[PDB]
Enzyme design. Sequence first.
Site, PDB file in Angstrom:
ATOM      1  N   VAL A 196       0.833  -1.198   0.000  1.00  0.00           N
ATOM      2  CA  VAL A 196       0.000   0.000   0.000  1.00  0.00           C
ATOM      3  C   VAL A 196       0.869   1.250   0.000  1.00  0.00           C
ATOM      4  O   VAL A 196       0.582   2.228  -0.700  1.00  0.00           O
ATOM      5  CB  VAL A 196      -0.964  -0.020   1.198  1.00  0.00           C
ATOM      6  CG1 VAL A 196      -1.751   1.273   1.266  1.00  0.00           C
ATOM      7  CG2 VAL A 196      -1.904  -1.210   1.096  1.00  0.00           C
ATOM      8  N   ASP A 197       1.948   1.236   0.780  1.00  0.00           N
ATOM      9  CA  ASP A 197       2.793   2.414   0.925  1.00  0.00           C
ATOM     10  C   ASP A 197       3.834   2.490  -0.185  1.00  0.00           C
ATOM     11  O   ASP A 197       4.828   3.211  -0.062  1.00  0.00           O
ATOM     12  CB  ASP A 197       3.492   2.394   2.283  1.00  0.00           C
ATOM     13  CG  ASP A 197       2.554   2.717   3.426  1.00  0.00           C
ATOM     14  OD1 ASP A 197       1.371   3.014   3.162  1.00  0.00           O
ATOM     15  OD2 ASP A 197       2.998   2.660   4.592  1.00  0.00           O
ATOM     16  N   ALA A 198       3.621   1.754  -1.274  1.00  0.00           N
ATOM     17  CA  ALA A 198       4.555   1.787  -2.391  1.00  0.00           C
ATOM     18  C   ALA A 198       4.606   3.180  -3.008  1.00  0.00           C
ATOM     19  O   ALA A 198       5.652   3.836  -2.992  1.00  0.00           O
ATOM     20  CB  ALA A 198       4.164   0.748  -3.445  1.00  0.00           C
TER      21      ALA A 198
END
Lengths: 57, 77, 77
Positions: B58-60
């Site tokens: 998600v935090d890519a």
Amino acid sequence: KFINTMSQVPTISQLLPLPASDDDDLKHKSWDYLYEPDPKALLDTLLRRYVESQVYQ
Amino acid sequence: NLNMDLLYMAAAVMMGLAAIGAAIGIGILGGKFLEGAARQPDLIPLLRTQFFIVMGLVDAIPMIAVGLGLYVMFAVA
Amino acid sequence: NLNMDLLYMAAAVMMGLAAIGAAIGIGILGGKFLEGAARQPDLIPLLRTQFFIVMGLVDAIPMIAVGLGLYVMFAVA
């Protein structure tokens, strides 16, 4: 009630309101069922089927 | 000069959206992690593992945008 | 000159978006938390713990957004 092969006693027992369980399922704390579809309409059917077995019994 | 107006404006709009993405994106995830634990908590350590596995994905992009925003604000001044 | 006005505008955008993100994320997470306790009260010890563990990750980025908004408003403006 069939008790011994030569001893049978007439009994009057209560089916509904449901008699009180001796055991406690506080130990079932640690899990809950994934009720599909929904718990109330399902408890209704469970209770109806239960009185039937006890009568049949 | 005029540059140091928008060089900040951009850095805001990039890092603000990057927040809205990162926060909500994890919340939608975290909720499903809780409702599963709240049924059979015996799996809490298992599910938590999977949680991080997916949260890293998600935090890519959000953290990439945050990095570019920090570069624009500090290095580009 | 015009610099401080749009610096305030940029910090405003940054903090409005950060507030949107943090609010909706923690809201969606807390909704499921408030469902879990009801299903299994007595483990509240535990669901609240996991809820804080997740809330930290939810807020990680909005905190940076607020930090840099303040950095602008009261060091750059």
